[PDB]
JSON list of C-alpha atoms in Angstrom, two decimals:
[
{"chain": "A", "resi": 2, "resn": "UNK", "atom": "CA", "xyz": [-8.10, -9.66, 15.12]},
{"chain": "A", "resi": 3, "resn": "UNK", "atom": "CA", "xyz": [-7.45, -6.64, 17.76]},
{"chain": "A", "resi": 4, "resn": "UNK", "atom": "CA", "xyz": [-8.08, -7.30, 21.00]},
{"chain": "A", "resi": 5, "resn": "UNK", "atom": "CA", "xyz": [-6.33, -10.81, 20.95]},
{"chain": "A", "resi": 6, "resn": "UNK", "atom": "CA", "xyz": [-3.15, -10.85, 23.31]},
{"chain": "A", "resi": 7, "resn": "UNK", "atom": "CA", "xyz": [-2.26, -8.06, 25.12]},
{"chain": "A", "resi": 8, "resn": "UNK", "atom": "CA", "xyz": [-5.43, -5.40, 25.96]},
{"chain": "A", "resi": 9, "resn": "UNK", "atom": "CA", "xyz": [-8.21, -3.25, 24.10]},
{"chain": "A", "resi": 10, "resn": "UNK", "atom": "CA", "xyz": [-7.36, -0.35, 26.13]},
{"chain": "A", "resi": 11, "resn": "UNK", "atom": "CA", "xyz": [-3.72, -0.23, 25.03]},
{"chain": "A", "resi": 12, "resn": "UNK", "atom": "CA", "xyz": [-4.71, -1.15, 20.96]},
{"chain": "A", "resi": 13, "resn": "UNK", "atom": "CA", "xyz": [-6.64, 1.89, 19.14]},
{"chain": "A", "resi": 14, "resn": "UNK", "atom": "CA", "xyz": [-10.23, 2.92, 20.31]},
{"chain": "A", "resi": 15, "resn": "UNK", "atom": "CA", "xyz": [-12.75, 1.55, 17.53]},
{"chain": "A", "resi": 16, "resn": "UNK", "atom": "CA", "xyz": [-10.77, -1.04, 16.15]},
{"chain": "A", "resi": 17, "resn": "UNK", "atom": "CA", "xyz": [-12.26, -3.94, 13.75]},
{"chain": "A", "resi": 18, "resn": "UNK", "atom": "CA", "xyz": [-11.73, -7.55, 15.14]}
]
């Protein structure tokens, strides 16, 4: 999972969850 604890912003743009 990406977005999960910190934020989607900060993780890479178009990432699979």
């Amino acid at each position: 999972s990406c977005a999960t604890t910190v934020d989607a912003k900060f993780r890479p743009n178009g990432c699979t969850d």
